[PDB]
Scaffold this active site. Sequence first.
Site, PDB file in Angstrom:
ATOM      1  N   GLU A  11       0.739  -1.202   0.000  1.00 38.37           N
ATOM      2  CA  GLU A  11       0.000   0.000   0.000  1.00 38.37           C
ATOM      3  C   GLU A  11       0.807   1.313   0.000  1.00 38.37           C
ATOM      4  O   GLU A  11       0.222   2.334  -0.270  1.00 38.37           O
ATOM      5  CB  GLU A  11      -0.828   0.049   1.272  1.00 38.37           C
ATOM      6  CG  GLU A  11      -1.697  -1.188   1.384  1.00 38.37           C
ATOM      7  CD  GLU A  11      -2.934  -1.106   0.512  1.00 38.37           C
ATOM      8  OE1 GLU A  11      -3.034   0.005  -0.166  1.00 38.37           O
ATOM      9  OE2 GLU A  11      -3.761  -1.986   0.450  1.00 38.37           O
ATOM     10  N   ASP A  20      -7.095   6.505  -4.161  1.00 35.02           N
ATOM     11  CA  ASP A  20      -6.582   5.169  -4.410  1.00 35.02           C
ATOM     12  C   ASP A  20      -6.685   4.725  -5.891  1.00 35.02           C
ATOM     13  O   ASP A  20      -7.087   5.468  -6.788  1.00 35.02           O
ATOM     14  CB  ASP A  20      -7.122   4.189  -3.399  1.00 35.02           C
ATOM     15  CG  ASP A  20      -8.549   3.777  -3.588  1.00 35.02           C
ATOM     16  OD1 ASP A  20      -9.105   4.190  -4.670  1.00 35.02           O
ATOM     17  OD2 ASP A  20      -9.075   3.006  -2.854  1.00 35.02           O
ATOM     18  N   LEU A  32      -8.770   3.623   3.731  1.00 34.07           N
ATOM     19  CA  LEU A  32      -9.856   4.268   2.962  1.00 34.07           C
ATOM     20  C   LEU A  32     -10.664   5.238   3.847  1.00 34.07           C
ATOM     21  O   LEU A  32     -11.046   4.898   4.957  1.00 34.07           O
ATOM     22  CB  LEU A  32     -10.771   3.232   2.322  1.00 34.07           C
ATOM     23  CG  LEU A  32     -12.010   3.853   1.676  1.00 34.07           C
ATOM     24  CD1 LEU A  32     -11.651   4.414   0.310  1.00 34.07           C
ATOM     25  CD2 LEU A  32     -13.045   2.782   1.478  1.00 34.07           C
ATOM     26  N   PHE A 104      -7.868  -6.799   3.809  1.00 31.85           N
ATOM     27  CA  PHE A 104      -7.506  -5.452   4.098  1.00 31.85           C
ATOM     28  C   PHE A 104      -7.836  -4.610   2.882  1.00 31.85           C
ATOM     29  O   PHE A 104      -8.370  -3.540   2.965  1.00 31.85           O
ATOM     30  CB  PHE A 104      -6.027  -5.438   4.408  1.00 31.85           C
ATOM     31  CG  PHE A 104      -5.495  -4.043   4.740  1.00 31.85           C
ATOM     32  CD1 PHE A 104      -5.165  -3.150   3.729  1.00 31.85           C
ATOM     33  CD2 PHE A 104      -5.297  -3.683   6.064  1.00 31.85           C
ATOM     34  CE1 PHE A 104      -4.650  -1.879   4.031  1.00 31.85           C
ATOM     35  CE2 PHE A 104      -4.756  -2.435   6.389  1.00 31.85           C
ATOM     36  CZ  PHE A 104      -4.462  -1.533   5.366  1.00 31.85           C
ATOM     37  N   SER A 117     -12.300 -20.290  -5.117  1.00 32.21           N
ATOM     38  CA  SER A 117     -10.918 -20.182  -4.728  1.00 32.21           C
ATOM     39  C   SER A 117     -10.788 -20.581  -3.264  1.00 32.21           C
ATOM     40  O   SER A 117      -9.860 -21.255  -2.912  1.00 32.21           O
ATOM     41  CB  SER A 117     -10.462 -18.750  -4.807  1.00 32.21           C
ATOM     42  OG  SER A 117     -10.717 -18.220  -6.097  1.00 32.21           O
ATOM     43  N   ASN A 132      -7.566 -19.992 -10.420  1.00 31.14           N
ATOM     44  CA  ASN A 132      -8.872 -19.427 -10.215  1.00 31.14           C
ATOM     45  C   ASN A 132      -8.849 -17.998  -9.663  1.00 31.14           C
ATOM     46  O   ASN A 132      -9.676 -17.126  -9.951  1.00 31.14           O
ATOM     47  CB  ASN A 132      -9.693 -20.331  -9.305  1.00 31.14           C
ATOM     48  CG  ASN A 132     -11.133 -19.896  -9.062  1.00 31.14           C
ATOM     49  OD1 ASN A 132     -11.459 -19.246  -8.045  1.00 31.14           O
ATOM     50  ND2 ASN A 132     -12.025 -20.272  -9.980  1.00 31.14           N
TER      51      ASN A 132
END
EC number: 3.2.1.17
Length: 162
Positions: A11, A20, A32, A104, A117, A132
């Site tokens: 990040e 973002d 965020l 996250f 998945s 996948n």
Amino acid sequence: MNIFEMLRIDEGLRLKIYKDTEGYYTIGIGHLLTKSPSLNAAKSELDKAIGRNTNGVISKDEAEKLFNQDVDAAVRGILRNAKLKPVYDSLDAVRRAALINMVFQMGETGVAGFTNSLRMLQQKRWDEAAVNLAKSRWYNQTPNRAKRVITTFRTGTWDAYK
Ligand SMILES: [Cl-]
Ligand SMILES: [Cl-]
């Protein structure tokens, strides 16, 4: 390597409000603020989050404090989630960090939706799960970060991050 250093590579750190990859108002280490287009709605949330009048700028320490809360919340959300918990419980330490990372980034709701998945991870079919996971908007939108996370799942090592 650990979840904190991993997420900090994915990040980055920014001390002034930024947008973002999806265009939303963020600050610090992928924190965020709002999905609203208004910079003012963003500064308001920010000040609410920090407990002071920030004028859109925060310190490294404040940035790290938000990050600590967010990783903590990510972990607790996984453990409270009926779909996610069994997955997390079945994984080794490295792969657990990989699932925390996806949460996250995309929230519990989003990850929980990767039904197929998830089932492959739980079954320890690494190669098939990686294949996948790649068929997703996620991988299409942030391919470099997705590859890293995916490689962490396939391999069980931190290679992609070293
Ligand atoms: Cl908050
Ligand atoms: Cl990327």
